[PDB]
């Protein structure tokens, strides 16, 4: 049975070269962003429901205003993932968060699958014209509902709502998961489909390493022999991994350069 240090050594030697990462809310609460269960909502999920949104878009736009860039900064978990990218090891980072902190940490978009979408671009709900996110920032930032300069339809940031298809880039899972030589899961259980069974889609020779509050989800339910769990504070687990990798100095370099620490 593998330990965290064994995984660290597989990475230090390039036995692991093609890392596939999956993240959720657990990597964003250390940036001061809360998790998920008074916005004037009949119930929580209504903020990402299209009918509710057509009847009252203000609560969603209030969230957007709070999540637009400048309110939160990435933390060590994001910066560790940037380091993976910088060291030629990141095949793909699949994220369920919508805070945009992966991009902010400087992981290129081509390495990211923002599976619940993004505020960086928007779409007319009516005629489907696309618009860059900055185009609606003024309006969101002044609490006005943005409207389509052609058809008047509400222009909605490209956050994925309940009942909508995941973004087209989600199709990369068809090729990334068979290609992965290491799967890293940080700060999420992956209880919701499809994320849960993507944990099953790597080959059984592939270590699956979980850094998370607790052991839950398909790694609990269907353990394989090269699974490793590193339970507890996510930040602490990452920093431990960093330290076994010998990347302490590179981490400090990177955090100082990006955030002025």
């Amino acid at each position: 049975k593998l330990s965290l240090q064994d995984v660290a050594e597989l990475i230090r030697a390039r036995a692991c070269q093609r890392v596939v990462v999956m993240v959720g809310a657990g990597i964003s609460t250390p940036s001061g962003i809360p998790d998920f269960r008074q916005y004037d909502l009949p119930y929580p999920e209504a903020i990402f429901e299209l009918p509710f949104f057509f009847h009252n878009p203000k609560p969603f736009f209030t969230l957007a205003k709070e999540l637009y860039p400048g309110n939160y900064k990435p933390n060590v978990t994001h910066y560790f993932l940037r380091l993976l990218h910088d060291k030629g090891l990141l095949l793909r980072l699949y994220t369920q968060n919508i805070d945009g902190l992966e991009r902010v940490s400087g992981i290129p978009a081509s390495k990211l699958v923002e599976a619940h979408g993004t505020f960086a671009s928007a779409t007319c709900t009516v005629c489907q014209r696309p618009f860059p996110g900055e185009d609606i920032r003024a309006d969101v930032m002044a609490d006005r509902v943005p409207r389509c300069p052609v058809c008047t339809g509400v222009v909605k940031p490209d956050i994925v709502f309940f009942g909508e298809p995941l973004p087209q880039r989600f199709l990369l899972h068809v090729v990334d998961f068979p290609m992965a030589d290491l799967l890293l899961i940080l700060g999420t259980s992956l209880e919701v489909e499809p994320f849960a069974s993507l944990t099953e889609a790597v080959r059984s020779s592939v270590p699956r390493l979980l850094i998370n509050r607790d052991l839950v989800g398909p790694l609990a339910w269907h353990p394989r022999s090269r699974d490793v769990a590193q339970l507890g504070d996510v930040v602490h687990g990452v920093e431990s991994l960093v330290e076994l990798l010998g990347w302490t100095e590179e981490m400090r370099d990177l955090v100082q350069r990006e955030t002025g620490k």
């Binding site: 990402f48 619940h116 994925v160 009942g163 298809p165 995941l166 499809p194």
Partner: peptide, 4 residues
């Protein structure tokens, strides 16, 4: 097929 895959929907949130």
């Amino acid at each position: 097929r895959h929907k949130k």
